[PDB]
Structures are given as C-alpha cells and as structure tokens.
Symmetry: D2
Subunit: 289 residues, 4 copies
C-alpha cells in the first residue's frame, strides 16, 4: 500500500532538511508543501512577505490534495509522498487520514520535536521565511498537545501559592534586594498565600554540593526576609537548561503539595515555560538571556 508521510513540527524543526535528505536516498517519494505553493502562486521572490488570505489558502490546500492523488495514482515506482508542512492542526491531520482512507493509502508520521529555546534560536535567524514569535509559541503549544505533554490545571485541596525566582527577581545582580518584588512576596504573605521560592543556581559545587543553596537560603531568609515555606534549587551537577530544571522541580516537588496560582520570574525562557504548562507568570524585567 502506497504511503503518505506527514511531518509533524514547528517551523525550523527540521522537516524540510529531512524531506530532501530522505527523498534523495529513497528514490520513489515526492515532496508536497504549502509554503512552496504559497510563494509560487504569487511569483514572490525569497525576500517577499506573503499576505494571508482565506482564498489563497483554499487554493493551496486544493493544490496539495490534487497533487497528492495525482502523484499517488502513477507508475508502480511511486512509493508515496511527503507533506512537509507543520501539520500541527489536528482537524487537518484528520483530513489527511480520511482522504488517504477513500483511496487506499496509509498515513505515517515523522516527528521533529525540538526544544522551544532551539526553535526560537533558529527562527530569529530564518530571516524572511522566519515566523512571528507569537505564531511560533502557538505552533509549539500545539506540538505539546500532540505529544501529550502535561498542562497543570491546579491542585484541589492543598493551599494556594505563588512561586518566586531568586536571580534577577527577588535579587538584582552578595547582591541587593529588588524592592518592589520582595514587597510582593510579603503582600501575598498577608493575603494568605504560601510562598515557594525557586532558583536555577546550582545547589553547590562538586565538593560542597550546597554551598550556593545555603548562601541563597541565608540571603532570602535574612536580607530579603521572604517568608517562604519551601525552597528548591537546581541540584549540583545539573547542566540541563533552566527551562527544563524548573519544570521538573515543579512537577516533582511543588504541584503535588500546592495549588499554584502564580509564578514570578524574569528569565524569558523560564516564563515561557510556566505559561505552557498552564501557570500564570509575570516577568518582572527584560530577561533575554
């Protein structure tokens, strides 16, 4: 049975580099792509900015299926076709499976799951064919939904709480307290909120695995006076992205003991994470690092 391969990825994920790579080695497959159709029918030049239209889209979609059927109804040399689109919308993925249903073709998937941070890096350098930051975020959001990744919906029972970062949030860089924010934690203290403190600093070093955890705990507790309830920090020896560390700490140490209602941070890649998993977050300062 001839196959129809759908690539599943956000722009910059690797879909195309793969499609060409593949097709080159597997003579028999052929590439079909929206971006290409979108540019060709406008005779656009690489540096042009395509304008969105419901009309042009229909056209483009039509061009896809028609070419699909048209290349899949050829010589017994045709192994199948690749749809190197983002394919992140489900109603669209379904559309393909149904279409391949009433013609006798199977549908396969080739995923290109790349970390948010890496997608952003490439996007910015995509240039013209780059994609706005707000659409990349949504894309990735749909990719998380396709992968099944979790979204925190709360925690019935346990007390509500606000999370605070240390570097750049409560502290400004033996640094000095960031007034307005430290006050915040103390105001959420009045209200009746539990205050969990968090930090991406390594707990300590090889020989003193808590050197920094201790130095931080001291600071927070004796210079900032943050009435915390629980403090968490990156374990010594962890070289994974801040992105990933704080999520893991949230799920394994926070989520199951608190009803998180807010998170305060400054680092963009972290703030971006809190919001994906379903946790409101306020960035207290420009943090593009």
């Amino acid at each position: 049975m001839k196959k129809i391969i759908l690539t599943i990825g956000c722009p910059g994920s690797g879909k195309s580099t793969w499609a060409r790579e593949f097709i080159a080695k597997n003579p028999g497959f052929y590439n079909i792509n929206r971006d290409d159709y979108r540019q060709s029918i406008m005779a656009h030049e690489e540096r042009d900015e395509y304008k969105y239209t419901k009309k042009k889209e229909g056209i483009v979609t039509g061009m896809q299926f028609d070419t699909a059927k048209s290349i899949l109804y050829g010589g017994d040399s045709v192994k199948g076709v690749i749809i190197s689109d983002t394919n992140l919308n489900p109603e669209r993925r379904l559309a393909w499976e149904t279409f391949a249903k009433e013609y006798g073709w199977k549908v396969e998937h080739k995923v290109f799951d790349v970390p948010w941070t890496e997608l952003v890096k490439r996007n910015s350098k995509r240039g013209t064919k780059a994609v706005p930051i707000d659409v990349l975020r949504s894309m990735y959001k749909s990719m998380r939904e396709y992968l099944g990744l979790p979204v925190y919906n709360g925690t019935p029972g346990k007390p509500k709480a606000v999370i605070f970062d240390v570097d750049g949030t409560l502290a400004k860089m033996t640094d000095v307290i960031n007034p307005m924010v430290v006050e915040l934690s103390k105001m959420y203290a009045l209200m009746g909120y539990q205050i969990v403190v968090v930090s991406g600093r390594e707990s300590g070093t090889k020989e003193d695995p808590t050197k920094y955890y201790r130095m931080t705990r001291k600071w927070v507790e004796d210079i900032a006076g943050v009435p915390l309830v629980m403090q968490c920090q990156r374990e010594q020896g962890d070289t994974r992205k801040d992105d990933v560390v704080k999520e893991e700490i949230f799920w394994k140490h926070i989520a199951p003991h608190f009803d998180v209602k807010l998170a305060i941070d400054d680092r963009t890649q972290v703030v971006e994470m809190w919001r994906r998993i379903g946790v409101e977050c306020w960035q207290v300062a420009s943090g593009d690092f």
Copy 2:
C-alpha cells in the same frame, strides 16, 4: 578639510543602505566597517556565526583607523570616509573625534533613528546577520541616550503609584476580569498606593468620542472594582503606535502628579517602553502583538 562621517544607528537602522546609496552618488568617499572586517578575517561564509573575542576586536579596530588614515592620506580626490558602524558607544565616538583631531580631519554625524518596534521587525528578518534581542535593546538604549530622550527618575513629593493597563491586563478578551491581576490592584490599594488606570483603546468614535472611554470606565469601576484614582485613554482619532501613546500620556498626565513605582501591562511593545523611560514593569502574559 577632509571629512570622516560616523553613522549613528542600531543594526537595521539604515546605515549601510545609505552608505552605498551615498558613495554611489558622491564619488570620492569610501566605506569602512567592522562587520566586514570581522567576517573577512575569519573567512566566514554569510551563514556563519562569528564568535566574540577581545583579541579579534583589537585587530578589527586597528584595521579601521589604519585604513582611515590610509585612505584619508591619498589623492586630492578623496573627499573622506564613512564609518558605517553602530557608533553607539560614546568612548568610541570620542576616540574618532580625537583621532581626526591629530591629523586634520573633521567629524560629521548621520543619524538613523528608527522606532524600536521597526528595529525589532527588521532584526528578526535579518537572518544570520541578525542580532540577539538583548543586544538590540541595549543598542537602542544607547541611541536614546545619544538623542537625549528622557528617563523618568521619579517624582519627589506626589504620592507613589502603580499603573495598570486594561486590555489583556485587568481584562481578558464585555470581557471578563483577570482574577490575579485585579486582586493585585486591590492589594496595592491596601498597602497605600494610588492606582492609575491606562488604556490604548480609542476613547471613542468620530461621532461618539468617548463611547469606549465610558464603556471602559464603567467596566473597570463596576465589574472589576478597581479603586483607581485616575483613568487615561487614547484620544479618539489617534492612529499612532500604542508604544508612543502611553509614553505621551505618562509625561503629560501622570509623571507630574504621581511618583510611579511600577507599571503593569501585557503588550510587549508597551512593556519595552515603560522600562526604557525608567519605569519598572511586569508583563502579566505573553503579548507579542
């Protein structure tokens, strides 16, 4: 007297497009540029990512002055040279004036002041030679300092206050209140803070110039219950960027009656503005629109 033209702009401002344009029409001038030297001495290809080095920089700087003196000490056909760099660091601008001092050349300036928002648009589409978002912000920050633009340092006397946006901040889009944030305004109400409300919505329409100001004032005051003290909104008929509107409203209506200690918003271009002028700001949600 031969001249040495320094272009003053952030990347994407227009420096180079101008330099080539100019030189083409004014036979006699010659271009000198860091970026070019930085790429040539590494034999880099357009798509390569140059790595920063204090050593390589020295080299590059040396290449500049040497070529400067070398092209300015030529035939009486040489009108002068253009330094198409960002030239935003002052210690560097001075260096040129002193150098041109001890050789008999005058220093001229050609400014390319482009709105932040426009710089960001182009940067993202610059591709490889694009520049990280954090360095663009600093660049622009230096450009504001060179232009003399104001930076709010506070207001001795008048009462302290926090500013709140409406669309997407206090309200989520007859929309519904955004819980955590509306609570914030009320908590800053306890403390003893004056709460100024702000909005980029047009006050009203041609015939009803306050239709929206009224609809907003009602909402804020009777559904959100925000104990504001002053409400400001974009005057009907204003088609300038949100960026620009709220700054103007700040300087002409807020700054002179309040000691602003914080601003709450969600729209990135606005949050970016509050911080340039020296006003802490917390983004309560992803707002890349």
Copy 3:
C-alpha cells in the same frame, strides 16, 4: 471570459519579475510555474542541481493543468492565471490553447524578447538557477522562430563566397597579419570562391567618416594581400552592438549578391549570430569580448 497568460521568453528574459509585478497590481491573477514545482517535489534547497526526468516532468505538467483548471474554476474574483514558463516549445503552446479551448478560457501572450548578449550576461550571473549555455542558445533559437526572424537558406544564382572579419581574424592586434587565416582567404581564392571582407570598426570619425575604412582597405589590400571582392564596415556614428551591425550588413549588402557558404570571425557574439541566421562560421581564436 477568464484568461490564461503564457509568458514567452528565455530564462533571464524577465518573465518572473513581470509576473510578480503584474499580479501585485492586478489582484485576481495567480502564478503557475514549472521551475517551482520542479524544486518543491524534490524539497531541493536553492543551491541544489535538479536532475532531469521524463517521469518528474509528467508530474510537473500534471500539476500545472490541474492547478490551472483548479484556480480557473473558482470565485468570480479570479481574473485568470499566468504561466511564467519559457513556453518556447510550440507543441506546448498549442497544448495550452487546446486545453483553454475545452473549458472556455482565452489564451494571451506576453513576450520578453531580450538580445542574446543580454541573456548571456544575466545567465552567467543567475548562479544556481542559471542554465547551461547550450540550452540558452537553443531557447533563444526557438524564440527567433516564434518571432519570425529570418534564417538564411542561401542564394541560388549568385557566386558562392566566404566572409572574413578584420580585427582579430585577418589581423592580430598598424597591426600584423595573422598568417594561417590570411592564407585561408587566399586558398579559398584558388578553389574559386568570392571573398567578402567585413569589419565592425567605425568607418571613420565625425569629420573623417572613412578614416578607418580607408586605413583598413589599405591594410587588407596592401599588407595582407587579401583578394577581396567587396568590403563592408560599420558606418561612422553607429553605436549599436557588433552583433546587430554585421547582420544588417549581411542582409542589405551581402545576401542579395552572394551565395554565402562560410564566415570567419573571432568575436563570440558575432560568431553566435552568423550561426543563428543559418551561416556556417569558424571562430579562429578565443574571443570573449
């Protein structure tokens, strides 16, 4: 009646620059193109070299008509479509007219006739999407056939003859004779051939309109000893390409009095011309100027 515009041109003629230009101003038309389809179905990157296949072509053609019918059978907003291909093969042009026949659409033409020399200039600088020199020549050859331009088939009656250029052919640059070639003219003298001499040098200058014609005639006749029968040269004040001058001189002064059986030259652009119009030609030296 909806229209289907076929652009007629060799690559580099201007087809695409026009299509985009047009479509931008005439909202309603849409671009369809082989090159685009050829690259998309291979997921090729700009710098890749497509490999020709009878199979892939069929595919591409199918993609054209299908999209043609598919975009021409849409909303009453669709004015028509543009086929920005070379469309130089007639069997192909016919195919379109017949197709548009059995659907109710008219076929229009938009020609982009550019001089050979200019096509070659652009081609070389086309880079990757450039086209081999032998295919450009054929293309252009088909364009001449579409324009109706003449092809010399001979001249029944008048005596046979060989044409010789002067600069770089009979003479090497008061220059000195090019031995082997001057001998040639004299050998074609034995055989029984009439020898017509030709030159792209201006006959003379403003005030002495024959200064060079005379200087040449002297040389040819008294240092080279070429037993010519007729000498022709570029009239003083003619700034048109050598290409064009010698063709005009051929048709208006040579073709009607001689049965040309060969032409000797060295300048590529001229040799290229002699052969298009149906005249054998031998290049006696590298002449890429």
Copy 4:
C-alpha cells in the same frame, strides 16, 4: 618564525572554503582578502557589480599589507596570516616574499589546481561574484605557467600539419560528411600540409577494442576521402575527459613527428585546450557539450 600563506588558485578553485576550514581548526591564523576589501569600501551588497579602478586597487593593496604587518606584529598567539587571493600574478607573489623578507616572516604556498572544465562549471554558478569567461581563461593560463605545464612552440624539422577531429568536425551526427570542413582538409592537402586525424571516440569495446577505430578509419578514408597521414583515437577503456585525452595523444604521438600549425575541432573544452598548449584552433560549430 611567523608565516604568511598565499593561496594559489583561479576563482572557484577552493581557496576560501579552505581558508575558513583551516582557520577554524588552527586557531592562530587570520584571513586577509582583496574581494572583501573591494566590496566593503563600496558598501556594496552581494548582488552589486564592482567597477574596476586603479585608485581603488591601490587602496585595497594598501589595506592588505597594513593589515598583514598589523596582525603579524601582535600577540605571540598569532601563528600567521592567509592571503586567500588568486595570487596568480608573479610580480605580486614576489612583492609578498620581499615584504615578508624585511620583517622576518616566511612565505608558504597552498595550491588549488582544478581542471579548466571544473572551474568553468563552478564559475557559471558563482552568480554575482562569478567572473567573466575571458578573465577565467587568463587566470588559468597563469596557473599553468605557475605549475610549469608545457606550451608547444613548434617542431623544427618535421613537416607542418593540421589536425582534424571527427565527431562534429569532419562528420555531422553512419553519419554524413560536413562539406565545408572535409573540403578544408583536402585544400590543406593541395598546399602541401600533412593531415593528422584525431578522435575522442573509444577505439572499441571490451571485447572488440578497435570496433570504432576501424569503423572510423573506414568512414574517414572511404566516404570523406580525407587524405590523412596518421589517425589517433582514444584507447578502449579510457574514461578521462576528452580534454585530457587529446593533449596526451598530441604530446606522445603528434608533437614529436609533426610541426603542428593548426587544429580543427568543434568541442569547446577541446578547442580551449589546443590554444592553452600553444596550438591555433578553429571551432567549426557551437560545441558546448
């Protein structure tokens, strides 16, 4: 002693791809290049066509040595510099050795000898930064002079002769004779010239190593009636370029028994070869294959 590496190659030879490759692995070296300086001082954009000037050149040269001395008189970390230019002019190569002489640096060479045919292939696809065909030929001509490759100056003693190709020269493609050319051989027969015939066709096949040599010899001798004196053809099993085959046959079988005064061919790559080695050649037809 610090080194100054001169790359020796025609454009497209590989100089730059190598320089970047090298420098990346050998931290300590730095690239200096004319092309870069030539573009930077005009603020040209990739797609611009630089205009040659004796003035701008001086500038560029000055920029080289100055940067050379300037980067070679730095920290003990500087291993040396690479001059990724064509460096094909000798007066220029000398200039470097003398310069590095009066400063204490040694001069090294890194050659990039690529076949003519391959240089032409890449050039055409170089695009903007491509180089005219006439300058490539000269470049390569200088490269042959630097490599020491031979240039035939004649053969005192042995009889003079003209060489003729078969495919496309004497024959037009059991093909049919090309009238005007076959007549030529017979006319050079009168004069008193020896006629050597040559062919790039394989002599024969695996089992019949002369099948084609015989078929050709028959044709030439009994249908064209060419009064040859010696026939040479590509030995069965030789898959090297026509370019290379005929040169080898010339040096090992022709040059030492004849005083070649002309060669007739049609294939461009072959005609290009005859002329490099110092043998006049006439292309009888467009042969870009």
